[PDB]
Structure formats: structure tokens, C-alpha cells
Design a protein around this nucleic acid. Structure first.
Lengths: 106, 151, 68, 170, 49, 27, 197
RNA sequence: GCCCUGAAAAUGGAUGGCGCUCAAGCGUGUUACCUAUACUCUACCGUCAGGGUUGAUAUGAUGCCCUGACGAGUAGGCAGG
RNA sequence: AAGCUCGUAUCAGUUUUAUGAAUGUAAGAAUGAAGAGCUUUUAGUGGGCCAUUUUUGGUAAGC
RNA sequence: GGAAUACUGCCAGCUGGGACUGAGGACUGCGACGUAAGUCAAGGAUGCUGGCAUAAUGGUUAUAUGCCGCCCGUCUUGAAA
């Protein structure tokens, strides 16, 4: 009744970078509560959606989406690597990304 | 086949991949309670009945409980919960792949519903709260970290 | 508990059994919390549902007792 | 991390000189090869030899005799610095020969900036009876019934946002 | 033939090693006759010799 | 107040002072 | 988590606190810091009082007015501190210190709503027990801030009017912790426990 | 060994900044992680080298293939457009 | 770049042993390379600075 | 006196999760399994299913954000100038 949530709420941190040169193909995602690489392994290869309203209606809904996959971990904090079809916009650095529970291994 | 090839396409090499039957993850034993992750029936508790010829699963709610018909579904779009029912009372062998062609609901299909459902309800009624458990919707609540969670 | 300096494994066990600490230990609200963390962690999804269902009842009886 | 290595060497047996003197020394190292490399370096400081002139006869590990006991360790140490080298002795209350020399090496870094290349460990010996203990910070635990607290306990949090406002009793 | 050959090789170093400690003697381990090398530094700034 | 940046003419005019201390010791 | 994480300086270390308060905006995290004045630091006082004035002198030549403006009021003191680790200047930056807010005292609407702290940055819990450690308040003042009191005073007020609050609550609970106690031990309950709850 | 002293001015000033003090400093040890046009693997381009291919190949033998390695570049040289 | 002989045992910024006052000559020494030598001709080229290692002269030093 | 257990090393041990890739195009080859018939994970991906024509999808331009980007040519000098 309160929740219809079937996903874990992570944020979109950056593009994988260096000091100097970012590659925008690899988006870095923090997920909620995940602290280790070990806890993250679970999320590897689940589908992510980034969701957002736009100005104009397209298919009877103002509410657009991008889709993509958690691919591997990143450092220790559980920050994770993620690739989308079209890359995520950078203007969205620090925005919410809905991480889902299909495909299950469980 | 009678019509000689008007254009020169080269035929394929003799490809070496036999189709082997799909090995399901340990947790799935027919008559298991599941959560559907995607579809019209995303977020429902749903009973496993039979693995299929098209590597899918045949599942019903059943319909009298949560409003899920006899449905096929994919193996990965489901979480297998530990709660198992009695399933052995059910006749399931009627339905295979071909049971699901389309070339307003068919009166044949609804007759198979009620045969399954009434032969199922009985077994759900044994366990406390299960009839209620199935009718409810699964969701995540704040602090449910699903790497921790047990299903 | 009472233990001599540099006590060996057998000797530790004896005195540990003499003081019978585990019974004392699991009696504390401290160890009870550690259990209560562990036992909750291993709830089934269905078993977790039950909890919600009970906590629905236990509330009704409680809110009855108040406003009196 | 360290292990102790019993090494013997004998400067390859020449004509008319069959089976020479055999030089036994216990070397603390991290691996068998550091150990061997250290071994020749000590050989060049005791007398005139070289790594090619001799042979490693037998290099074998030594485990600690009773590593569920707490001993006290009186250690002799030669070490180099900015100045000319100089002999030393410290004491270490410890479990194992090996963890002792280890914890000494940290202290030898912390206080005197000297690294593993500089330090020769001369001799490590258990002291059996008390009163042979010449250092205060060791004698400090050799009192009957030493009951003390660890006040101001840092509880390491994983989460950044704590609601309790952390109190440090123990 | 080779499977028997390597197995018996290592077993008769083992036994010979065990024999020295029993007989109070010392066992010379047979000189290493084969090395593997791997390049560890890149192509630039390497001296000619 | 004094600074704690090493200007590069100094940072490398230290190396060229340190090199002069190398050739001094040998002779 | 929570949309707004009203923090609270009261025993934190200007630095550290900052840093984290920082990252958190950068990662889209509406914060809000309170009791700035009860922020702390490291070192004697007669230091921060330097490691500052110096800062003060700074200022511009030809035109003093156009230059490194030396804010007094705590809040800001600490601001800076932070707008100093956030590439401020660039959309993503501005877009942050956009997300920030640092009051001295703890005015509404925040008075009324839970706050919190940031382990990983309390004097108590980081400074080797018993070591020199400054406390803004003075440190502000000492160099301009004209209010220490207002805050102060128009404080004590708050604390009051609250604690008062408290009570009323402490009183309340008690009752619960009592009802639950009694109407605790009857079946239903029991059961739960088994599962744990 | 660390610390203060062990003098250097004059437009405001820089461990790069903020800031740091049981460090985010010094010494040392252990692991984990970050990333280059580097290395590994696969595809692709091109070049070079080695080859196959006719009582003719279901495409111009100045074709159609098979294998492998290689690929910075000024003056300058050679070649294809 | 063309031509001729080879396609090799033709050599190598390498080590070793041998033989003399870091360094000369040989190998039925090792490792690596099928890319070598002989004709004939034809473009471009005559900048220094820094570091290293031996010294040589050097007084407050630097050099 | 009797076991263990760590550590080092092995396995042509077993069982999972994730990403990237699918070059090639009748058959020949080396094999494996089967008593044989045959089959195969054996000289490089096949199988099933879903989405559309007022489509699906793909592009152009204008900006936005992240990260990077010293003014082109000529002529000196050791390059910056």
C-alpha cells in the first residue's frame, strides 16, 4: 500500500575517470547500504534504470527512461561500475538510479 | 525448395551446437512460492507448478487468490522463496508449449483454471496465513538490503 | 571468573564450567541482542510476513489499553 | 611478517681441504631467499668470503617451541645509522621468538629510522627468572594481579550518520 | 613413462632428504639446471650493453 | 611569513647542488 | 535514507566535518548544519586565532574592497572551509553549495526536528584525550562576530522550551513501555519473540 | 629520532587549494583498491613475408584465397589514388 | 635502387674458456638471427644543450 | 604417547555468479563417448520467444553538463622565446 518498490535506490556518482581523462561509458553507481565488494557481487548484472520526466509527451507519458547493467565492482566502498545503452548524461551526476532485481540468481 | 537459387548465397558451415535441456537453479522444486519481478503481475506471490519445453515455468497464483491466471514465466524474472506447498495432488501434464498459441477470453482456458485452483486451495488452507500471504504484494521496505535478505 | 595466571586449555575449560558462564552470558540483554540480530536475519519472506500480521494484532490490543 | 631460518654454509670443499668449518646462524627473514641473501652479507662481515665462493648447505625453518606461552625477550642488536654503527639491547615481552623480532623491527624503524638492511640481530634469548629484567616498561607487567582499564574506547562506525551521539564507556 | 619418472624423482629427493636427518648427515640439493626469465622493464631508456 | 612551495629552479637547483657534493667526496 | 540530514557541529572538527558534509552534496545530499558556533577544531586557541588573522591580512592591494573577504560569523567561517573542497565555480559545484546551509544556533524549522552527528568527526573520538582544542565561539568573536550572545541567550531559550518538551514525551513513553510491558507476555507476543520482535 | 632555536625584510600568498594533529604529518609493515596509446586476448584496417589455386575455379590468375608477423616519424625516398 | 653469388654456418654494442702486459688473439664454447657479402649509382646531412662515468687543473666558492 | 590443525605446494578436483566476444561459412582434420548404430562441449553460435507501418528506430542542428584543448604560418638559436 505504501511501497511498490521492487528496486534498490542507488545514486549516479561519476564516469570512471582518472585525475584527467574521463571515459563516459562507465558510469559509477553507489547503491544503498552496500559497503563492500562482497555485498556488491550480488548486484552484478542486474538491470539498472535511470528515470526522469522530460518536457514533451512521447508515448502517452512524459516519463522517460534509460536502461543498463551493473558490470563489476569499483574499489571497496561498493561503488559499482555500470554501462547503459545510451550513456548517462553527466548533468545527472548525483542523481537517483533505480537498480532492479531481475535477473535473479536467487 | 523446388525453386533453384536465383542468387548465389553460400550455405552455412555444419554448426556444432546441440540444444541441451536447461538445468534450473537449486531452489526451484515444483510447488514453490515465487515473487514475480517483472510483468503485469510484478510483485505478486505465485506458485510454481511445472518446468517447460521452452525453458520457461508454468505458474498460477492461483487465480482465485491473487488474480494470477495459469501463466508461463521466465526463470530469471522470479525470486524463489523457501516456502513450499504440496503440489503432487495437481494434474499439470495437460499444459505444454502448444497450450499457449493465439493464431473475449477462451471458455476452455477458464475451465482448466478452476480444476487446478480447487485442487490447490485445499493445500494452501492447511498452513496458517498462506491464503493471506499469497493475496498480498511483495515489496522492499526502507532498510531491506537485498544482499542481506533471505527468501 | 577466577583463573590462575597463564592457565592452560583444560584448566580454562574446568573453571569456565565451574563459573558456568554461558548460562550467565546468554541471560544478559547483551547476548539476547546478538541473538535477536541473528534470528531476525534468517527470517523467510513468508515468516517475515507473519511478523507484520502479528504486529497488526499486537498493536490493536496495545492502543486499546491507552486512552483510559 | 617474519620467519626464522637455520642456515649453514661451508666454502666449497677444495683439494686437500675436505669438509671445512660450517657456520650456523639463525636468520629472521620474510622468505627463504631473503634469508639466503642476508646469510652471505653476514658472512662478509665475519670474515673474507663471497656468495660464489661458498655454498648454502642447509636452510631449514624453526617454529616456536610453545606459542601459547608468554615469555620475555632480551635482544642484542647491532645497527647502523647516520653515524657509525653501535651495539644495543632491548627487552620484549611476547609470545614467540618470531613475533618478538618482528615487533622489535617496528620499534627500530619508529625510533631510530633504521631499516631491515641495517639491522643485524645478534642474539635473542628468553629470560626465565624475573629480576634479570632490566627495563621498566617490561617490569611494569610483572606485578601480581595487574587489573587495568582501557578508557576512551573508539567505536569504529561503518555508517557516516549516527543518531545516538556516541558515548565511550567500557 | 614420464608420469612415473617425475613422481619417482621427487620421491627420491624426499627420501634422500629424510635420510640425512636420520643418519645425521647433510643432503646437498641438486643444482638448479633450468631457469625461466620474464622481462620486467619496458623498451625505452635501456642501456646498450 | 615564509613559503613551503619549492620553486622548480630551486627544486632542481638542489639536485645540481647535490651532484656537486658527490664529486667533492670522491676527491 | 532521508532527504534532509540536518547535521550538528556541536563537537566536530571544522575540517573533517566539512570534507564529509562535502562529498555528500557532491553526491546529491541535502544537508544543513546547525550550532555552527559550537564547532571545534584542533590546537590551542591562540592559534586558530593566527592561522586566521594572517588569512585576514590577505585582502587586496589597489582595492581592498574587491578582495578576499574575511567573514566573521562562524557559519561562514566553516562554510569557506568547505566551499573549498568542491570545485566551486562549476555548475556541479555551484549546484552544490546550492544544496548546503549552515546556521549558527538552530532556528526553525530545524529546532523541531531530529538532528545527528558524524562520528568520523567528533572531538571526543579523534583527539588524543586531553589535547588543545579550540571552539569557534571564542574564535569567531575574537575577530568580529557580534552576537555570540544573542545566539547564546536567544538560545538557552530553545534548550528550555524543549527539554520541557522532552519530559512530556518521557512521560508519554513510560506509559507505553508500560502498556506493552503488561499486554506483553500474552501469546501473540510470545510467538513474535520466537521469530524475534 | 622527533620537536623549538639554529636570522630575512619590504604590493596580499600559498605542502597546489581547502584543511589536517591516537593525522589526512614522520618511520615501518601488511593487505585491498584506482588507472596509460604499456601488457594479454578477440575483431577490423593496411603493409610485409610465406604459400595455395589449370585437362581451369558457381567473379577480371594484373582474379579468388590460406598462414604469420608488423604498424611513431622531420629532411629525404618509394608507391597507390 | 638495380645487378651477381649465395641462403648460409654469413655474423653479433653479449657472456665464457684459452693465451699476454679495465684490455689484445682463438674456440670441435653458449645464446640469438635463414635478412649476408660483392658490384654500380643517389637523395638528405657538417645543430648543440643536459645528464652519467673516468679523470686533469683548481680557491671562499662554484666549476 | 597419540592425533590433528595452520602454513607452503599440487590436482589432466567438483560446483556456482558477472562482463566482453560469436571471427568464419557445403563436406574433408585431430578426437572423445558408444558393443554397434551413431552422438558430441571435436578445424570460431546456435536454438526458442517478444516488440512494428499514424511504427520500430535512426539522424541533423541549437544549447546544457563532465573531462580535455596555449594562435595559425615562417625564420633563427640547444629548445621555450
Amino acid at each position: 500500500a505504501e511501497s511498490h518498490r521492487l528496486y534498490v535506490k542507488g545514486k549516479h556518482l561519476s564516469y570512471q575517470r582518472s585525475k584527467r581523462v574521463n571515459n563516459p561509458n562507465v558510469s559509477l553507481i553507489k547503491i544503498e547500504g552496500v559497503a563492500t565488494p562482497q555485498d556488491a557481487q550480488f548486484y552484478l548484472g542486474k538491470r539498472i534504470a535511470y528515470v526522469y520526466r522530460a518536457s514533451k509527451e512521447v508515448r502517452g507519458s512524459k516519463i522517460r527512461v534509460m536502461w543498463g547493467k551493473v558490470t563489476r565492482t569499483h574499489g571497496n566502498s561498493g561503488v559499482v561500475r555500470a554501462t547503459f545503452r545510451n550513456n548517462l548524461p553527466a548533468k545527472t551526476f548525483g542523481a537517483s538510479v533505480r537498480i532492479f532485481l531481475y535477473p535473479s540468481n536467487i | 525448395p523446388k525453386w533453384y537459387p536465383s542468387e548465389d548465397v553460400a550455405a552455412l558451415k555444419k554448426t556444432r551446437k546441440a540444444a541441451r535441456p536447461q538445468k534450473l537453479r537449486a531452489s526451484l522444486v515444483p510447488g514453490t512460492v515465487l515473487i514475480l519481478l517483472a510483468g503485469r503481475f510484478r510483485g505478486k506471490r505465485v506458485v510454481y507448478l511445472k518446468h517447460l519445453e521452452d525453458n520457461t515455468l508454468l505458474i498460477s497464483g492461483p487465480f482465485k487468490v491473487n488474480g494470477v491466471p495459469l501463466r508461463r514465466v521466465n526463470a530469471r524474472y522470479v525470486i524463489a522463496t523457501s516456502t513450499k506447498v504440496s503440489v503432487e495432488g495437481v494434474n499439470v501434464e495437460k499444459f505444454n508449449v502448444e497450450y499457449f498459441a493465439k493464431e473475449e477470453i477462451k471458455a476452455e482456458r477458464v475451465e482448466d483454471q478452476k480444476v487446478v485452483d480447487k485442487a490447490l486451495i485445499a493445500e494452501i488452507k492447511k498452513t496458517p496465513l498462506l491464503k493471506q500471504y499469497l493475496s498480498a504484494s511483495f515489496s522492499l521496505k526502507n532498510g531491506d538490503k537485498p544482499h542481506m535478505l533471505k527468501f | 571468573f577466577a583463573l590462575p595466571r597463564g592457565a592452560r586449555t583444560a584448566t580454562v575449560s574446568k573453571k569456565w564450567a565451574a563459573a558456568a558462564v554461558c548460562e550467565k552470558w546468554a541471560a544478559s540483554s547483551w547476548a539476547k541482542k546478538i541473538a535477536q540480530r541473528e534470528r531476525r536475519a534468517a527470517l523467510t519472506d513468508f515468516e517475515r510476513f507473519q511478523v507484520m500480521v502479528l504486529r497488526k494484532q499486537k498493536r490493536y490490543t496495545v492502543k486499546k489499553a491507552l486512552a483510559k | 611478517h617474519f620467519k626464522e631460518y637455520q642456515v649453514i654454509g661451508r666454502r666449497l670443499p677444495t683439494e686437500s681441504v675436505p669438509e671445512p668449518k660450517l657456520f650456523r646462524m639463525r636468520i629472521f627473514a620474510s622468505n627463504e631467499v631473503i634469508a639466503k641473501s642476508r646469510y652471505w652479507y653476514f658472512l662478509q662481515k665475519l670474515h673474507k668470503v663471497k656468495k660464489a665462493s661458498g655454498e648454502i648447505v642447509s636452510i631449514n625453518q624453526i617454529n616456536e617451541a610453545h606459542p601459547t606461552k608468554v615469555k620475555n625477550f632480551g635482544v642484542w642488536v647491532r645497527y647502523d645509522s647516520r653515524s657509525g654503527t653501535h651495539n644495543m639491547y632491548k627487552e620484549i615481552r611476547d609470545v614467540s621468538r618470531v613475533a618478538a623480532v618482528e615487533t622489535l623491527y617496528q620499534d627500530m624503524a619508529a625510533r631510530h629510522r633504521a631499516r631491515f638492511r641495517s639491522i643485524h640481530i645478534l642474539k635473542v634469548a628468553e629470560i626465565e627468572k624475573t629480576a634479570d629484567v632490566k627495563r621498566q616498561y617490561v617490569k611494569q607487567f610483572l606485578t601480581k594481579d595487574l587489573k587495568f582499564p582501557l578508557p576512551h574506547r573508539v567505536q569504529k562506525s561503518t555508517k557516516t550518520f549516527s543518531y545516538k551521539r556516541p558515548s565511550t564507556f567500557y | 613413462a614420464y608420469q612415473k619418472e617425475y613422481e619417482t624423482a621427487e620421491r627420491n629427493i624426499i627420501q634422500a632428504k629424510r635420510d640425512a636427518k636420520a643418519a645425521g648427515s647433510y643432503y646437498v640439493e641438486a643444482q638448479h639446471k633450468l631457469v625461466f626469465v620474464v622481462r620486467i622493464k619496458g623498451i625505452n631508456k635501456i642501456p646498450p650493453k | 611569513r615564509q613559503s613551503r612551495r619549492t620553486s622548480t629552479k630551486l627544486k632542481e637547483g638542489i639536485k645540481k647542488k647535490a651532484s656537486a657534493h658527490r664529486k667533492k667526496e670522491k676527491k | 535514507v532521508e532527504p534532509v540530514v540536518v547535521i550538528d557541529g556541536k563537537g566536530h572538527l571544522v575540517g573533517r566535518l566539512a570534507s564529509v558534509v562535502a562529498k555528500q552534496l557532491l553526491n546529491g545530499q541535502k544537508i544543513v548544519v546547525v550550532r555552527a558556533e559550537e564547532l571545534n577544531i584542533s590546537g590551542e586557541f591562540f592559534r586558530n586565532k593566527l592561522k586566521y588573522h594572517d588569512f585576514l591580512r590577505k585582502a587586496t592591494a589597489f582595492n581592498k574592497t574587491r578582495g578576499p573577504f574575511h567573514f566573521r560569523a562562524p557559519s561562514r567561517i566553516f562554510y569557506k572551509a568547505l566551499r573549498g573542497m568542491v570545485s566551486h565555480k562549476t555548475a556541479r559545484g555551484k549546484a552544490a553549495l546550492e544544496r548546503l546551509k549552515v546556521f549558527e544556533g538552530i532556528p526553525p524549522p530545524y529546532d523541531k526536528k531530529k538532528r545527528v552527528v558524524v562520528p568520523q568527526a567528533l572531538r571526543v573520538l579523534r583527539l588524543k584525550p586531553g589535547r588543545k582544542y579550540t571552539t569557534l565561539g571564542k574564535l569567531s568573536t575574537s575577530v568580529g562576530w557580534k552576537y555570540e550572545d544573542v545566539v547564546a541567550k536567544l538560545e538557552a531559550k530553545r534548550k528550555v522550551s524543549s527539554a520541557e518538551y522532552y519530559a512530556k514525551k518521557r512521560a508519554f513513553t513510560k506509559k507505553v513501555a508500560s502498556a506493552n510491558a503488561t499486554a506483553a507476555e500474552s501469546d501473540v507476543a510470545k510467538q513474535l519473540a520466537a521469530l524475534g520482535y
